[PDB]
Amino acid sequence: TEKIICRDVARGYENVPIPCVNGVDGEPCPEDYKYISENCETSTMNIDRNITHLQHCTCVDDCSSSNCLCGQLSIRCWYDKDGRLLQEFNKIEPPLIFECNQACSCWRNCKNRVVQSGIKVRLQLYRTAKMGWGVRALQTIPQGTFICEYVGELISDAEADVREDDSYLFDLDEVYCIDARYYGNISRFINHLCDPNIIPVRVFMLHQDLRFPRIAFFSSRDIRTGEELGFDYGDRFWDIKSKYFTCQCGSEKCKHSAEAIALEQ
Amino acid sequence: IICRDVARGYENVPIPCVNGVDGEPCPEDYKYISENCETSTMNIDRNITHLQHCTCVDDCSSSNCLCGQLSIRCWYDKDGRLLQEFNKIEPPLIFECNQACSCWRNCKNRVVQSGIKVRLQLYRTAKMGWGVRALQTIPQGTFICEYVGELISDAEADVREDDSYLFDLDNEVYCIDARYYGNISRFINHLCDPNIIPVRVFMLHQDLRFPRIAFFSSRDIRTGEELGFDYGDRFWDIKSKYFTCQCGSEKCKHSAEAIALEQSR
Ligand SMILES: C[S@@+](CC[C@H](N)C(=O)[O-])C[C@H]1O[C@@H](n2cnc3c(N)ncnc32)[C@H](O)[C@@H]1O
Ligand SMILES: C[S@@+](CC[C@H](N)C(=O)[O-])C[C@H]1O[C@@H](n2cnc3c(N)ncnc32)[C@H](O)[C@@H]1O
Ligand SMILES: [Cl-]
Ligand SMILES: [Zn+2]
Ligand SMILES: [Zn+2]
Ligand SMILES: [Zn+2]
Ligand SMILES: [Zn+2]
Ligand SMILES: [Zn+2]
Ligand SMILES: [Zn+2]
Ligand SMILES: [Zn+2]
Ligand SMILES: [Zn+2]
Numbered sequence: 107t108e109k110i111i112c113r114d115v116a117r118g119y120e121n122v123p124i125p126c127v128n129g130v131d132g133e134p135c136p137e138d139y140k141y142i143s144e145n146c147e148t149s150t151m152n153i154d155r156n157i158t159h160l161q162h163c164t165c166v167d168d169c170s171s172s173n174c175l176c177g178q179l180s181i182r183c184w185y186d187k188d189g190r191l192l193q194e195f196n197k198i199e200p201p202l203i204f205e206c207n208q209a210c211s212c213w214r215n216c217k218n219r220v221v222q223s224g225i226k227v228r229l230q231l232y233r234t235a236k237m238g239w240g241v242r243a244l245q246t247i248p249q250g251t252f253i254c255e256y257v258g259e260l261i262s263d264a265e266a267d268v269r270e271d272d273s274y275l276f277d278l279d280e281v282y283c284i285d286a287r288y289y290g291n292i293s294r295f296i297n298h299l300c301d302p303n304i305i306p307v308r309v310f311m312l313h314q315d316l317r318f319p320r321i322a323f324f325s326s327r328d329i330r331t332g333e334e335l336g337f338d339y340g341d342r343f344w345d346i347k348s349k350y351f352t353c354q355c356g357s358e359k360c361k362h363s364a365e366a367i368a369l370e371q
Numbered sequence: 372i373i374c375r376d377v378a379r380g381y382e383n384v385p386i387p388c389v390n391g392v393d394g395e396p397c398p399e400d401y402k403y404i405s406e407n408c409e410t411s412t413m414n415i416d417r418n419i420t421h422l423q424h425c426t427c428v429d430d431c432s433s434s435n436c437l438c439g440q441l442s443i444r445c446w447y448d449k450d451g452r453l454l455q456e457f458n459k460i461e462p463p464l465i466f467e468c469n470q471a472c473s474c475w476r477n478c479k480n481r482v483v484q485s486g487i488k489v490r491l492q493l494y495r496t497a498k499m500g501w502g503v504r505a506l507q508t509i510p511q512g513t514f515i516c517e518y519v520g521e522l523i524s525d526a527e528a529d530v531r532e533d534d535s536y537l538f539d540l541d542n543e544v545y546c547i548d549a550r551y552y553g554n555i556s557r558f559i560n561h562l563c564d565p566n567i568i569p570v571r572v573f574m575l576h577q578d579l580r581f582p583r584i585a586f587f588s589s590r591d592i593r594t595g596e597e598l599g600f601d602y603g604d605r606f607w608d609i610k611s612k613y614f615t616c617q618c619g620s621e622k623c624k625h626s627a628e629a630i631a632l633e634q635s636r
Binding site for chain 1: 404419552
């Protein structure tokens with residue numbers, strides 16, 4: 107039986123509920139962490155929040171013209187009229203995206219505000235066969251759609267270095283990390299895929315302190331109903347971890363499986 | 372109808388501007404912001420581990436809610452209005468629930484963080500420049516709007532030219548200066564018999580230098596009635612050398628006549 111074990115792991119903090127189900131085993135809803143919808147701090151990071159340091163636009167239309175200074179910070183605004191990344195978006199080396207902010211003359215519903223508007227797609231936390239908890243789509247999601255943000259505790263590299271559990275760490279290449287082990291959102295449950303269907307993009311919204319980009323996941327292709335979400339964790343993860351477990355993504359493209367490791371040797 | 376929404380879509384509802392009185396254009400000598408801003412290093416304590424928080428598994432309507440107890444009790448009724456018993460002369464500090472609390476985002480202790488719900492309008496008054504009025508009946512105890520602006524130290528406030536849009540945060544001490552950056556509250560006129568009252572509130576941080584200032588109706592308010600709060604004795608002590616109060620109430624405390632009588636007493 108597939109059991110509904112939490113109606114909403116976000117406790118009403120997201121735009122939509124994110125339920126949890128388990129049809130595999132008796133493991134209950136995960137509660138060894140604190141669900142947070144926005145990045146938190148546990149020591150002073152001194153993020154630059156001075157409103158006069160913001161780059162900002164002078165638009166009073168919907169920010170769809172090429173005169174929008176905010177879009178010009180990434181050559182162009184990369185969102186189409188429905189908030190999706192443009193077909194030609196560089197999915198290998200994404201540019202930094204500067205969304206409109208409180209210093210801009212535009213309205214809060216201009217076309218340069220996708221990530222700040224939050225989760226719209228319907229996601230579900232579920233028990234996988236071989237990779238613990240994972241996150242899947244409850245609906246068809248077109249290419250270039252914003253899925254969720256990678257949220258957690260902002261920490262220094264020095265702090266990352268003394269922590270035991272490094273399995274929920276995202277690198278913001280002083281250098282910083284988001285650690286989602288103790289505090290995080292739905293993204294902490296997203297597994298690694300060697301054939302990923304989401305891509306991380308660095309985004310700026312309410313501040314433009316370049317040390318602390320916010321990490322937004324967008325679909326890299328059309329995603330089918332029921333499909334598990336996954337991003338490429340990267341080489342730093344697997345260089346550390348492959349000595350202890352191998353990739354179970356099951357793809358013919360898999361480059362971190364025991365069979366992939368044996369073939370390289 | 373000279374502006375559909377002075378807030379540019381930043382609030383839950385629009386705040387239109389009208390002028391049926393004179394030729395004054397919609398005010399634009401300030402920047403509308405929905406949340407307080409900084410123009411110097413303030414380092415508001417955002418450390419999540421410094422939040423007092425509750426362990427409630429209900430809607431935080433019980434007297435056992437720690438957050439309510441920090442506030443003496445929770446003063447919100449089931450509809451988010453202050454209890455008739457609320458102290459309107461010397462209001463307590465309110466601690467709303469927050470991201471560290473175990474409760475849901477829809478708990479009964481989250482009125483101010485949920486934002487504006489009443490229909491307001493920026494309008495041209497007969498004798499007092501711009502003012503703010505209600506476009507609906509508003510029961511006693513309803514959250515109206517927050518006093519939002521630029522956070523400055525007493526030192527910075529001590530050297531600023533225009534002190535007409537300043538609110539003191541007496542806890543070091545600090546001020547909100549709404550002259551250059553501010554929300555709809557910057558346009559609210561002074562009343563010696565006010566229909567709204569300021570309350571110090573804590574939501575996403577509990578840095579005691581920076582309570583957020585939330586106005587609640589002190590009585591039932593009729594449609595079209597102008598909002599007003601009592602600016603207080605410091606304001607009038609400084610300004611009465613230039614002008615005196617024109618609220619016109621029999622309860623007026625800061626007219627030329629009231630001040631003459633004060634000197635007699
Ligand atoms: C950030 S967590 C993801 C959520 C995790 N599955 C859980 O149940 O909490 C990362 C951990 O999930 C597991 N995992 C993620 N992707 C994997 C993959 N492709 N193969 C094997 N294990 C994986 C590993 O234990 C990894 O250290
Ligand atoms: C914060 S502003 C209020 C909005 C202002 N009416 C405007 O048009 O921008 C405060 C100023 O409004 C005027 N004002 C507000 N209430 C008043 C009152 N009851 N009596 C006299 N002047 C008042 C004074 O010039 C005061 O310094
Ligand atoms: Cl710094
Ligand atoms: Zn623009
Ligand atoms: Zn814009
Ligand atoms: Zn902009
Ligand atoms: Zn793989
Ligand atoms: Zn509670
Ligand atoms: Zn609560
Ligand atoms: Zn609480
Ligand atoms: Zn008066």
